[PDB]
Amino acid sequence: SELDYYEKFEEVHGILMYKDFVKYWDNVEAFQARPDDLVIATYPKSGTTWVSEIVYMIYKEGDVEKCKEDVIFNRIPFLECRKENLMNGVKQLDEMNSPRIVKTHLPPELLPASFWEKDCKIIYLCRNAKDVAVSFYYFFLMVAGHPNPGSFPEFVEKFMQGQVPYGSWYKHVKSWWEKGKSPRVLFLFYEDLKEDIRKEVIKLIHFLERKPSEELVDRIIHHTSFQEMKNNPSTNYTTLPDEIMNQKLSPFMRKGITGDWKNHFTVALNEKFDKHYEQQMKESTLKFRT
Amino acid sequence: SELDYYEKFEEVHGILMYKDFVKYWDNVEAFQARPDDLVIATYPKSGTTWVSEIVYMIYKEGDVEKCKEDVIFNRIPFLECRNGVKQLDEMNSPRIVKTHLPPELLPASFWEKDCKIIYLCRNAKDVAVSFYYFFLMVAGHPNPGSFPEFVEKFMQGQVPYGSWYKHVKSWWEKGKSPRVLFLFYEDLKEDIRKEVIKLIHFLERKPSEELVDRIIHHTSFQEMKNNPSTNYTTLPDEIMNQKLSPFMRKGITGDWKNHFTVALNEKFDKHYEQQMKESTLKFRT
Ligand SMILES: Nc1ncnc2c1ncn2[C@@H]1O[C@H](COP(=O)(O)O)[C@@H](OP(=O)(O)O)[C@H]1O
Ligand SMILES: Nc1ncnc2c1ncn2[C@@H]1O[C@H](COP(=O)(O)O)[C@@H](OP(=O)(O)O)[C@H]1O
Ligand SMILES: Oc1c(Cl)cc(-c2cc(Cl)c(O)c(Cl)c2)cc1Cl
Ligand SMILES: Oc1c(Cl)cc(-c2cc(Cl)c(O)c(Cl)c2)cc1Cl
């Protein structure tokens, strides 16, 4: 197992990362942003795809047709993603006409300097740690490039130690929470989108300086609902071959709820996790709902 | 598959039972008890072996050498198992009888002769875990399915010997009588000395520090786990594949926390309340 992780991951700037990405990190380091670039940042499996489609719809005034012109991972390039010449986020962005929407899972400390220098707006989305752990576990099982996660308890231990891609979820959300105090960095919660999607959609429309009409909001709401996105080949990653994403084992649009952790954490693992969580987050005003 | 699951079982008087036992059930119901017979009754996986060895040691005044003259399932016949009835019929008194039968199904002869009975119960969650591994390792059992699936079966009493809830509630009522000693696995775990002394007095034996000392040492989990007379290792893998899961598995209280998800635990507790809130019987998980 530890050997598996050693083969699959490597650190960059002290953060564990997919080895393929690290090989060409210089391209990420020197990435050139544009003033109107919009960054969507998240710790893995926090609802990136969901908010990305909401944002894309807002950019297209809710035109569903314009949102299916290409798959989501081509419409919204994954900044640091690189797999030799098979996948290249920086290349996709470089050739992309503005306004560009950039997806990234990088903690603030690793975001390319250009983005800060150009004062680009950023939307950060987070989700409670327990549900993120469950979602990430299945991701490890379905997606190529990951070591065997082993049992759920084993995987959760590594999660608690930040020994997974992008490092510590705890440090990730806390660092972005600080950046979120800024007006140009909108800090959102997955659970808030679940509880009152209308409120969050209207919040996003205003953040992006667009006009919130009843018709636009309505289109966004049903189009970005879990069931619709799960069936939408543009947003469900099903165009990817099984060797890349084996959705037969687990679909990308898995369950889309808050609280699935209760179906995976044993009572003992939950007790241990909560204790560790409290130590990690006690000194923070950031509060999540499970 | 439900079909494959129940193919291994057959109901007898309302409770699911190992098909082989049922074939000879008339012999069980017609069993002839003796006045000095001692019955050790338990729902499966509640510590039967543990309390059986404690009782045997008391009968043998703590003579460890005597407790190893034969394997436990021969020293203390499993009444309804088949050949328990034969072993008992051919055994000299005083006889110690092991059984997992609810009080309503205990052979009439035992009640008619007013035999002493020791009943041992354990919290439902830990019993479910212990029983789950028993299914995986013991022949005669179908695939228990996933743990959540097995727990569902357990809650519905769709396992050998039926409803744990009805089993413990009925025996609790019988336990009100001074003739039926009602014990808890958790009590043996928390203060074995207290329970051993209680057992010695119940069995009208003279307690001594030596006797108590010997029993406590001899009946510890580690000792019994390594003792071939009590760990069921003499049975071939075909009968009991302990490579999959040993009979003497963990011997603790609370292992349920390592198996029940938060969701399953919540569902189980809700169901538990509906089944037990009217009983004065109180546990500890
Ligand atoms: N429209 C939507 N509504 C709710 N959850 C959604 C969603 N689109 C994606 N998700 C969930 O977001 C997670 C994927 O996150 P990301 O896009 O950051 O990789 C998955 O969580 P689950 O695995 O818990 O179902 C997925 O089901
Ligand atoms: N001396 C001892 N101390 C504690 N637990 C014991 C024990 N001997 C057996 N057990 C436990 O009693 C259970 C078997 O019960 P029975 O004899 O009725 O079939 C097993 O529980 P676990 O599976 O939880 O470990 C087993 O480990
Ligand atoms: O959000 C994502 C994260 Cl964190 C990682 C990958 C991802 C997918 C494949 Cl197939 C890989 O080989 C690697 Cl190294 C990363 C994809 C997405 Cl969409
Ligand atoms: O306590 C026990 C219970 Cl409930 C069942 C068996 C048991 C063991 C085997 Cl190998 C079988 O084929 C059957 Cl049908 C029951 C053994 C013990 Cl010791």
Side-chain angles (χ1 to χ4, degrees), chain A residues 1-60 62-64 66-82 84-86 88-210 212-282 284-290, chain B residues 1-2 5-9 12-18 20-64 66-67 70-205 207-221 223-237 239-242 244-272 274-285:
Chain A
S1 179
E2 288 300 299
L3 180 54
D4 209 345
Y5 276 73
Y6 174 67
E7 285 189 46
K8 306 298 182 187
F9 309 138
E10 164 171 294
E11 297 187 354
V12 62
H13 295 306
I15 302 303
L16 197 60
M17 183 67 53
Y18 293 98
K19 188 165 293 187
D20 287 328
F21 297 10
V22 185
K23 189 182 177 180
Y24 302 90
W25 205 265
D26 286 345
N27 270 300
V28 175
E29 200 77 12
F31 183 74
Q32 292 303 303
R34 292 169 191 167
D36 61 342
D37 278 353
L38 170 63
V39 181
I40 294 180
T42 59
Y43 184 81
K45 318 314 300 172
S46 302
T48 316
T49 313
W50 190 9
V51 69
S52 287
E53 188 67 5
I54 291 172
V55 169
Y56 209 85
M57 277 284 279
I58 295 175
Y59 268 50
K60 300 304 185 182
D63 192 317
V64 175
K66 289 183 176 183
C67 290
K68 58 180 178 181
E69 270 183 48
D70 205 333
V71 293
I72 195 168
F73 51 94
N74 282 340
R75 285 185 281 123
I76 298 175
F78 184 181
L79 175 64
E80 62 267 20
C81 183
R82 181 67 177 292
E84 296 299 352
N85 292 300
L86 295 60
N88 193 156
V90 166
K91 178 173 180 298
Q92 284 181 287
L93 289 170
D94 284 341
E95 57 167 39
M96 184 172 274
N97 296 163
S98 301
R100 309 185 295 192
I101 298 171
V102 185
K103 163 184 164 175
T104 185
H105 295 305
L106 298 169
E109 300 77 20
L110 279 65
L111 188 70
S114 192
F115 288 107
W116 298 123
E117 280 302 311
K118 293 206 177 300
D119 204 21
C120 303
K121 291 186 182 180
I122 299 170
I123 293 167
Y124 181 75
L125 173 68
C126 60
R127 185 178 192 189
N128 79 78
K130 295 176 181 184
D131 285 338
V132 166
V134 175
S135 188
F136 211 176
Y137 177 72
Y138 285 104
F139 194 71
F140 263 62
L141 295 169
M142 150 189 95
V143 185
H146 296 86
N148 188 328
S151 69
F152 186 64
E154 291 171 355
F155 180 73
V156 173
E157 172 62 17
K158 280 201 154 293
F159 181 90
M160 289 189 276
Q161 302 311 321
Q163 289 164 19
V164 298
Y166 293 96
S168 172
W169 168 92
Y170 317 82
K171 290 176 179 181
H172 203 283
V173 301
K174 285 188 290 177
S175 291
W176 274 111
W177 174 243
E178 289 307 309
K179 296 300 181 184
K181 292 178 178 179
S182 169
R184 299 188 70 69
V185 179
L186 183 70
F187 196 100
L188 303 177
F189 296 83
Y190 179 92
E191 294 72 23
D192 287 356
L193 275 61
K194 287 292 299 184
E195 182 175 66
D196 191 347
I197 185 64
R198 183 177 299 286
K199 181 183 193 298
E200 305 306 309
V201 167
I202 293 171
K203 181 193 296 181
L204 279 159
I205 289 171
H206 286 315
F207 179 68
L208 298 177
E209 296 171 283
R210 262 75 173 182
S213 67
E214 227 64 58
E215 269 175 37
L216 171 59
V217 175
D218 286 347
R219 286 202 295 287
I220 293 171
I221 291 173
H222 76 86
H223 177 73
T224 62
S225 61
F226 179 77
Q227 198 48 262
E228 277 197 41
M229 290 189 63
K230 176 174 178 62
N231 302 323
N232 187 353
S234 183
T235 59
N236 67 189
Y237 287 75
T238 60
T239 58
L240 289 180
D242 289 18
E243 317 81 81
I244 296 181
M245 281 202 192
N246 189 344
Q247 298 197 52
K248 295 186 180 181
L249 297 180
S250 185
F252 191 96
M253 295 300 176
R254 203 180 58 87
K255 285 192 179 179
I257 66 170
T258 285
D260 195 36
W261 61 270
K262 293 195 172 190
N263 297 308
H264 297 86
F265 280 73
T266 53
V267 172
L269 185 63
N270 189 51
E271 276 173 31
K272 182 172 184 172
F273 187 98
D274 284 345
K275 184 169 182 170
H276 173 277
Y277 185 91
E278 185 263 51
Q279 292 307 303
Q280 291 290 306
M281 309 293 281
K282 65 178 181 181
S284 178
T285 56
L286 171 60
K287 302 297 179 177
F288 289 82
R289 289 187 294 170
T290 63
Chain B
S1 178
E2 299 295 64
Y5 185 80
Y6 296 96
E7 181 285 304
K8 298 284 185 174
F9 308 130
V12 64
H13 296 305
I15 61 170
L16 211 55
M17 183 60 49
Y18 299 103
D20 290 296
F21 293 12
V22 179
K23 302 175 184 171
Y24 318 89
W25 213 260
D26 286 339
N27 291 299
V28 174
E29 313 199 309
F31 186 73
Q32 292 301 296
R34 301 169 187 170
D36 61 352
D37 276 350
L38 173 61
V39 178
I40 295 177
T42 60
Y43 183 81
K45 317 314 300 174
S46 305
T48 316
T49 309
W50 188 10
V51 71
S52 287
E53 189 70 352
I54 293 177
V55 170
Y56 208 81
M57 277 282 278
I58 296 181
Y59 269 56
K60 300 304 178 181
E61 300 183 63
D63 194 309
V64 178
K66 296 179 180 180
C67 295
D70 206 332
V71 292
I72 197 168
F73 50 97
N74 283 337
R75 287 183 280 123
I76 301 174
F78 186 176
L79 176 65
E80 64 269 18
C81 178
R82 181 172 178 175
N83 186 171
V85 169
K86 180 171 180 297
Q87 304 179 283
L88 290 169
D89 289 335
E90 299 173 358
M91 182 174 279
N92 289 164
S93 293
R95 306 183 297 188
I96 299 175
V97 182
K98 163 186 172 180
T99 188
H100 296 304
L101 295 169
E104 300 92 341
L105 298 186
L106 188 72
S109 194
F110 290 109
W111 297 121
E112 291 170 353
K113 299 192 180 304
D114 204 20
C115 302
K116 284 191 182 179
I117 303 174
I118 292 167
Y119 183 72
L120 179 61
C121 66
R122 190 183 186 184
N123 80 78
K125 300 179 188 180
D126 282 338
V127 165
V129 176
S130 186
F131 211 176
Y132 173 83
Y133 286 97
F134 196 65
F135 266 62
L136 295 175
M137 174 270 281
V138 180
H141 295 75
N143 188 308
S146 66
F147 187 64
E149 290 173 351
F150 183 67
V151 170
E152 191 60 58
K153 286 291 196 304
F154 185 92
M155 290 190 281
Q156 300 310 312
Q158 298 301 157
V159 294
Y161 291 93
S163 175
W164 170 90
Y165 318 83
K166 299 215 307 179
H167 203 280
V168 304
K169 282 186 291 180
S170 290
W171 274 116
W172 173 248
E173 292 307 310
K174 296 299 184 182
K176 290 178 173 178
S177 167
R179 199 65 172 169
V180 181
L181 185 66
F182 195 100
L183 302 175
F184 295 81
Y185 178 96
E186 292 71 24
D187 289 352
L188 277 66
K189 286 294 300 185
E190 161 180 87
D191 188 355
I192 186 63
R193 180 183 170 95
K194 186 175 185 298
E195 303 310 308
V196 169
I197 293 177
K198 176 189 305 183
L199 278 161
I200 292 171
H201 282 147
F202 179 68
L203 298 179
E204 312 297 313
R205 257 71 177 186
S208 68
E209 286 306 308
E210 177 187 295
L211 178 55
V212 176
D213 294 325
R214 291 184 175 182
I215 294 174
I216 293 177
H217 170 68
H218 181 70
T219 62
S220 76
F221 181 73
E223 290 291 345
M224 290 187 70
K225 177 180 178 57
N226 296 160
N227 183 347
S229 180
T230 59
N231 62 194
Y232 286 78
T233 58
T234 55
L235 298 181
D237 296 0
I239 294 179
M240 216 172 266
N241 191 332
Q242 297 196 53
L244 309 170
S245 184
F247 194 97
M248 304 302 203
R249 200 178 59 85
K250 285 192 185 178
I252 62 167
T253 288
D255 195 32
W256 65 268
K257 292 190 176 188
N258 300 308
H259 298 82
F260 280 72
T261 56
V262 173
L264 186 64
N265 187 51
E266 280 179 29
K267 182 178 184 175
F268 185 100
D269 284 344
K270 184 179 179 183
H271 172 270
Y272 190 89
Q274 290 286 62
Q275 296 287 307
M276 311 290 285
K277 68 166 173 290
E278 280 78 45
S279 180
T280 55
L281 170 54
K282 300 302 176 176
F283 281 77
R284 293 192 297 177
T285 48

